[PDB]
Amino acid sequence: QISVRGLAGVENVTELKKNFNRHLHFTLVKDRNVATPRDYYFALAHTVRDHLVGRWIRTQQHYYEKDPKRIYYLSLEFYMGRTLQNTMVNLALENACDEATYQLGLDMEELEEIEEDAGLGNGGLGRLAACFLDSMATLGLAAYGYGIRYEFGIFNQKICGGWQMEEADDWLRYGNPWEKARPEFTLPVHFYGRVEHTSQGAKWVDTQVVLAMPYDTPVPGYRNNVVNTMRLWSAKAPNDFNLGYIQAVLDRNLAENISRVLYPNDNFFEGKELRLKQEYFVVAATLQDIIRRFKSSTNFDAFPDKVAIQLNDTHPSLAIPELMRVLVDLERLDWDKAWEVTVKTCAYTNHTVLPEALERWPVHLLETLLPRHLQIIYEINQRFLNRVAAAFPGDVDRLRRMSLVEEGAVKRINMAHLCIAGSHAVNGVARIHSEILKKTIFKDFYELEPHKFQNKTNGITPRRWLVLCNPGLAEIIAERIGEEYISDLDQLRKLLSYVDDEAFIRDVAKVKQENKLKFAAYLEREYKVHINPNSLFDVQVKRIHEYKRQLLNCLHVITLYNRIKKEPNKFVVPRTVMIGGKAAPGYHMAKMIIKLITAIGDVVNHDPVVGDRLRVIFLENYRVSLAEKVIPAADLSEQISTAGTEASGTGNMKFMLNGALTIGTMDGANVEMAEEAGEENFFIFGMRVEDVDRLDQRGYNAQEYYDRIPELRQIIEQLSSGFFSPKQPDLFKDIVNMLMHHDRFKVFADYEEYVKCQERVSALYKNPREWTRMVIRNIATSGKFSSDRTIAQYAREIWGVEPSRQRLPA
Amino acid sequence: QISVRGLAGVENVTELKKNFNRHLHFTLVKDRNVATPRDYYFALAHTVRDHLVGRWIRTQQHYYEKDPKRIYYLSLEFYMGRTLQNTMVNLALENACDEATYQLGLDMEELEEIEEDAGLGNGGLGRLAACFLDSMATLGLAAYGYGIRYEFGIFNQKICGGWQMEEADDWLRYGNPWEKARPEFTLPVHFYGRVEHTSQGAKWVDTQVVLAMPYDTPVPGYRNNVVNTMRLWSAKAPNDFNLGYIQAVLDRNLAENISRVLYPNDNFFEGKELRLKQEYFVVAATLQDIIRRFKSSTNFDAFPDKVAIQLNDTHPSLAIPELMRVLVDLERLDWDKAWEVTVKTCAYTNHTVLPEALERWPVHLLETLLPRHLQIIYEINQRFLNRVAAAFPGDVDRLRRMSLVEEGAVKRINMAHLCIAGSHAVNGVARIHSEILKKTIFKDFYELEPHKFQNKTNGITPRRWLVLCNPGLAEIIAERIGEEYISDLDQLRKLLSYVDDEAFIRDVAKVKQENKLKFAAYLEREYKVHINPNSLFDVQVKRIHEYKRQLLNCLHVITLYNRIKKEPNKFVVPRTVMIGGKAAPGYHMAKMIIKLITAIGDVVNHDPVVGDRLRVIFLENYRVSLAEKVIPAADLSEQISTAGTEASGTGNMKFMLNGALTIGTMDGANVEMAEEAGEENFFIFGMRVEDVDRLDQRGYNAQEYYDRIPELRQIIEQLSSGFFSPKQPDLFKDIVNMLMHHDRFKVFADYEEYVKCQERVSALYKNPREWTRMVIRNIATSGKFSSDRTIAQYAREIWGVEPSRQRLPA
Ligand SMILES: O=C1NC(c2cccc3ccccc23)=N[C@@]12O[C@H](CO)[C@@H](O)[C@H](O)[C@H]2O
Ligand SMILES: O=C1NC(c2cccc3ccccc23)=N[C@@]12O[C@H](CO)[C@@H](O)[C@H](O)[C@H]2O
Ligand SMILES: *Cc1c(COP(=O)(O)O)cnc(C)c1O
Ligand SMILES: *Cc1c(COP(=O)(O)O)cnc(C)c1O
């Protein structure tokens, strides 16, 4: 149908059809009389998987022959979403499969909707991992994603009476056709035990063994015939485990619990033993694999020339002492040589500002679980603090602040400190964030080793986040400037010469309108709710957190509502306000915010005076596949974190690419986005970082704003008095109380400037042509925010490898 | 190579080869450079599975169209063993696959050895289930095996220092290519809750739900293109289960424990809740499936014309009250009509003599777990005892003895009593056993309803147990009388006209010698032990139990040893004595017997005076696949249970078919075996049932035998004094003590007659020609012991269906 989706050759279509029927019969053991849509999805999935296989085998073969330097991306999270469409896009099979399925009398779109999200992540960090794998494959890097195959991913969110309920994401129930179990590459991982000191150095003995069984998933690059591997480990008990009889067999589940469930805390740290077991499990199994592969090329001097290990935050920080343990205790390298190898191998990406999100493991935990690793950590600390002392003689305070070991009631290891010490490169994930690392939280580490600190501004893959989710926009772009932009997104800048082209303006607005119609219809069928598709689609989708200030959004929504009620017969630009996201199960306040959103909806959406001028919708179960639908439908992207709290953000980039204007603070990558588009093409409001600091010094008194802003006082009185909760008038006292006395994120401070800025948005929306021109200026300057740019910077400036757009043979 | 293995057409071989390479590439994602024998096994397995698929789909289609009466074989055990060779035999693909693999440079036999046994059974009962499925498919019956997909089957037996160690049978580790998960046919099963009585009858409420997910495995008939289904249920938690967050997800394992592990008690009853959950789980899921299928043909009068349910012992006895519960509580039939339907649908096979093996469930267990089923059981009991009272007025004692409810400290339900009451047919598993049911343990039930009691003497499938495990013997038989005997084993009787044919005598002895050479070699490589292949192979393989009197065998072995030591320079027929089997993990005495066997081996096998004249070998990890190797190699089959204790036995039949002579008691099917062959062609010894009764009346005094038999006294003194346990002289005091004071199975009573009979065996073995002639007379009369005969009797005399040898189209 559309060009970017590839050719549908007669031969290709015929071949896909016959392979689809072969899999239905032989693979699924169904005839056409009893097959369900789900059988058809599986038959198609198996058919597309077959086109990966040749390329996967040849790619891995190629890496054995050429023996390039290998990149190991260690993450506890890969937020992959669905695989079927992504595979079709990257192998140029989408039109052929559409055609082949059409002729079988099936609708491919309906079959795509049957696929489960692989939800093995919480949000931004997990998704960044997924976007990176895509870009690494597209840039022909010999890269491997390593993580955990959780049996249960991020929970499915149900709303009951306006409250979040969690239910288990049983994503493997029907089988995963994309993974290949490799039970033959199973590896032992050790826990507990104790350290014996002998003549021949330290020995780790009397350990409990858990096996790590790898599952490999193909990662296809964009039309380059490259297929990289994502290897995820699953925990399995050894067969002698506990070995009255019956109970011993049932107790195998204790070991296998390690890979059972993803911890659902976005940007918070819980010091749980099971979480630490997950961290070591992935590190220990991965390092053995890395070393095995390296030895099939006694001399570890070349190790860093053949191996890069990237740590996705501190979650796999144990890679540093584990690498030391293997090199020192097993390979019998001296300490200094092993340390050299380790530093030159490892690099650490920080994704964290908020101190409560930083991993600080109690020493008693590490002592019991990983006795040898704790010894190695103490040794690292001593040698590190010896260098600090020599460089800064007499600065005893610096020594305290820089220690890997935090003193206190409980001693803790600061895993971030361990990562900086043991890595040749430390980066943040947007320029402002990287600067903040150098100026505040790692100021001391920066002064000792300035050379280590880099920036790598985040990005998103334009495959999933444009071509896949928004084919209509991809196509009208491709009509003017060709297809090359999909693997070279800077080419979108050529669209600035179409900003006054009437036809292009018409087409950009048409695509947006079509996406909105399609999303409105989706809301009706799947969730029995009606919305005006001619309204401005104001969407804030992201995990529910105080720093992201969904509450600020709520305050705006109630303001619009109170303004309509005061002057019912005055024109206002209609809006559909859509807020979506999951709260961490133990985060009370996040759960109250969801409840407040739905309570506002309950009042606003049933007020007859409001009409269809204002609708508030909570989007249930926000996940990757819902993001692919709602982001192409959005007009206004809400990126309204308190300045200094969002390290980067990546949602922001998704919306920029997909033809929404941004209302945001100068936070994270918002800063670079506004710089690329021009500040005049961006709705900036609120305190800068500098302003937040000024407020903190003299002290934040919310009362002052309540006293000076009547519109805000009204809202707070409504909340307090039960306007939004008639049956339980005090339901939201925790929210009021926090806003008035304990608001770390200064919601009131940005309120006035936000509401004013929101008025400027409405004004521009009244002028479709000028709205769409500003949209074009955004899309056209979004090139920097491709993960291809990001990975190319990682490769040249950290990993020491050159990317390539050259194709492997087919 | 050999004719019974089928044709190797040029086309067939070429096609198998290309499909093997296709699966290696696309299914396994391997090239030939990195593939292991295990990858080759899987490629072959997937290639053979493909030939089942067409036939499986067409067979199930046929049953929908023709709508024949359906047979449901409910068992907690299916001891299937390996599937690959069996599939090849039944589809006539064995020579073609041999040829195809040969040309790929692989050895098919080596690939067969990589397949795991499906060990979802303990021994005789589980294997009977497997043999039956084979015969049901071969006889074209619309039959379904229903059971539990245990994650862990019967444990792997290791011997350490002569002691049994158990380790977990992780049979699914590498995947099961033979099963098809059917997650779309998942069904809820209920536990706990309580009963509400309303206007509209009883309601079972506030239950815990476990889901039952079916896995289907194909069961091919012998060259008739019929493929039946074995459906096994796996337990899965619902997604709202327990739904702090993390722990709720981890607690899902409590529900899934139901299908985790097979209980390893052969012929013993443990009243464990988890075992009762397994029993209900398989019953509840199966009955829903049965009813669903029946409704796709409100009127249950035809239910018994369309459904037969066979209960494999009492393990699925809850099918009776469950069927009543569904019909009465859900379908709203009146009690009497529902009861009629139930009785006419259900039939019960008893496999049990020993009272400690009979299932007697505490009422408090059923009360908590299955409140409604207990109500229905009490109601069944009342109405049943009302009929007893009317037929036998005043016989209050009979009422007590026949009650489904046993009075005592703990009240118990006698599940056997429930099965007789609720079934139209009750059978034992050999003639002597069926008579004993009528004369002793169910005498009362027989007098009330004589029409219900039948015999169905057990059998073994000649596919696995001749063609598959002993191709050389199959072939020389086929040379003379053709191939038809494989599906009509009575034709073996034609071999009696070859008993004086010199060439046939030569060939039978040659095959035996080749099997022995091959098995001797197997012992050397896999277990570093050497044996004389010219010795008589005396084998006793079966689960370790007191009633099977492995100890009697031990007494014979020590007798031979003491006789050699007394007269070292006298000729004795050389013997390799091989004893194998598993003990239940909590059965102390069975574990001591294994230890004694290995301790005798430790003395006998290292005595230089003995030479290679006597060797004692404990065969480790006896299982179906080891039985396929050792049974064709055997000369003497040891079937030496105390008269009245072995319900049937089936090992006995396997050896008869495979050219071993039998030494046995008149127990179980031994009686019918001797009647078929002629008593002169069988080594019968020991007490009959009548003799055991006579001994019990006056009392069994072991001392008397010890006092009168010097040879036996010597053995007991050796055991006591530490001759067989020098470092621990009192190691075997429990064994001595039991033999002398607490022997329920009267080992000493049969000792003299056993040893004498063993001398007659040795004498005949000195005369090869006459030994082989007697072997021929055994093989030739083994036809009755085909499971095809057995199933044909079940079908005509219980299920009311006619078997068929007519082929479905290919
Ligand atoms: O989305 C994120 N979660 C965590 C994060 C920070 C700290 C601890 C965690 C623990 C688990 C999961 C995620 C985290 N960090 C985040 O990383 C993204 C990728 O660079 C950034 O765009 C976000 O601005 C940042 O908030
Ligand atoms: O092998 C068997 N196990 C049990 C058995 C009896 C009682 C309780 C059980 C519980 C679990 C497993 C098996 C049993 N019964 C047996 O059934 C076989 C098939 O008819 C007979 O040939 C055996 O003579 C008999 O011993
Ligand atoms: C991109 C993405 C995120 C990250 O969004 P932010 O707005 O940067 O927090 C979270 N969740 C999903 C499902 C995404 O696709
Ligand atoms: C046939 C068989 C049995 C039953 O043997 P008996 O001697 O009748 O107890 C037990 N186990 C296996 C592995 C078998 O093949």
From Swiss-Prot, chains A, B:
- Modified residue Phosphotyrosine is at which positions? 192, 215, 446
Where N6-(pyridoxal phosphate)lysine occurs along the chain? 654
Site annotation Can be labeled by an AMP analog: residues? 144
* GO terms for cellular component: skeletal muscle myofibril
Question: Mind telling me which InterPro entries this protein's record contains?
Answer: Glycg_phsphrylas (IPR011833), Glyco_trans_35 (IPR000811), Pyridoxal_P_attach_site (IPR035090)
Question: Catalysed reaction per UniProt?
Answer: [(1->4)-alpha-D-glucosyl](n) + phosphate = [(1->4)-alpha-D-glucosyl](n-1) + alpha-D-glucose 1-phosphate
For AMP, which residues are the binding ones?
31, 64, 292-297
Positions carrying Phosphoserine: 3, 403, 487, 720-721
Specify the superkingdom. Answer: Eukaryota
Q: What PROSITE patterns would the database entry show?
A: PHOSPHORYLASE
| Recorded coiled-coil stretches | none
Q: How is its activity regulated?
A: Allosterically regulated through the non-covalent binding of metabolites, being activated by AMP and inhibited by ATP, ADP, and glucose-6-phosphate. The activity is also controlled by post-translational modifications including phosphorylation.
Q: Which UniProt keywords apply?
A: Acetylation, Allosteric enzyme, Carbohydrate metabolism, Glycogen metabolism, Glycosyltransferase, Nucleotide-binding, Phosphoprotein, Pyridoxal phosphate, Transferase
> Which residues carry the site feature described as Involved in the association of subunits?
97, 131
Its cofactor is:
pyridoxal 5'-phosphate
Output the CDD domains linked to this UniProt entry: GT35_Glycogen_Phosphorylase
Q: EC number(s) in its UniProt entry?
A: 2.4.1.1
**Post-translational note:** Phosphorylation of Ser-3 converts phosphorylase B (unphosphorylated) to phosphorylase A.
Q: Can you tell me which family this protein belongs to? A: Belongs to the glycogen phosphorylase family.
Its function?
Allosteric enzyme that catalyzes the rate-limiting step in glycogen catabolism, the phosphorolytic cleavage of glycogen to produce glucose-1-phosphate, and plays a central role in maintaining cellular and organismal glucose homeostasis.
Its assembly, as annotated, is: Homodimer. Homotetramer; to form the enzymatically active phosphorylase A.
Q: What is this protein called?
A: Glycogen phosphorylase, muscle form
Species source reads Oryctolagus cuniculus
Q: Which gene encodes it?
A: PYGM
